């Protein structure tokens, strides 16, 4: 199965390079990659680099993560905030590793996936699913 | 960080 | 499971942007994407654009595919040729769709994955696996 | 196409 993974990847990549899409799960992944790049840009110019702002005390990464996320969606959910959610998680994985804390990377992924499933998914379903997100971020 | 993310987040959403 | 897919993607992407790797299955995917970009470049300058050279007669795509591939590895296998194998398959998916033949895309993926599994995998194992490929293409 | 792919392919391999 590892060999087919390599083939579906790359093919997705080469199709995307020509404005095409392997599947529109792959277009979601693509659109979200681009959105994160633009978000991390307009966040940088308006304030500081998101990753530099991160300073994780040892054994407080979960609390740090849950605090920002719970505050981000305190009063509501929207696509632009979900983008912020991914970028912040990405910045946290990059801020980890930098400080030789690679163990956190898998844990962060679990925190993100869990929060996405339980708390954000219901909103996503009512607002036309991830397919809608791609239309707005073409 | 939380307020800042909410800002660009909300600016993105209102943009489209 | 779709939600975790989105998280592992993006995180892999953001980690790669900083020279890091989610897993070294992800480094294989990354290295192969880059290799394909460089191959398609040095192929373009030395000859013509690989995709332009493709002119697929209807209902002859499999024969066209199997002919080039079987000739490519006729006398041996090496990493540079496996790169050619992926790029050619990628060019074929892009040449399809262009001519409104999207049905072929999944079929091509099946041809590639099958050939990779049955014919190329054994060589890959004896030469230190895909991990070796990443070292040479850092 | 087959011979051309073999060329850049073999040039890649010998490069490393």
Numbering used by the authors:
A (entry chain A), C (entry chain A): 3 to 26, 83 to 196
B (entry chain B), D (entry chain B): 90 to 105
What does the paper say about this structure?
We selected BIM BH3, one of the key BH3 members, as it has a high affinity for all of the anti-apoptotic proteins. When compared to the structure of Bcl-xL bound to BIM-WT and BIM-DM,43 there are no significant differences in the orientation of hot-spot side chains or registry of the peptide – therefore the reason for the drop in potency is not explained by the static structure of the bound complex. The on rate was also altered in this series of peptides, being 10 times slower with BIM-MM and BIM-DM (2.08 × 104 M s–1 compared to 2.3 × 105 M s–1 for BIM-WT). Crystal structures of Mcl-1/BID-MM and Bcl-xL/BIM-MM revealed that the constrained peptides adopt comparable binding conformations when compared to available structures with wild type sequences and/or peptides constrained with the α,α′-disubstituted alkenyl amino acids. Furthermore our structures confirm that the constraints point away from the BH3 binding cleft and do not introduce steric constraints or new non-covalent interactions with the anti-apoptotic partner.
The canonical structural motif involves a BH3 domain from one Bcl-2 family member adopting a helical conformation and binding to a BH3 binding cleft of another partner. Our biophysical and structural analyses illustrate that whilst the introduction of the constraint increases the population of the bioactive α-helical conformation of the peptide in solution, it does not enhance the inhibitory potency against pro-apoptotic Bcl-xL and Mcl-1 PPIs.
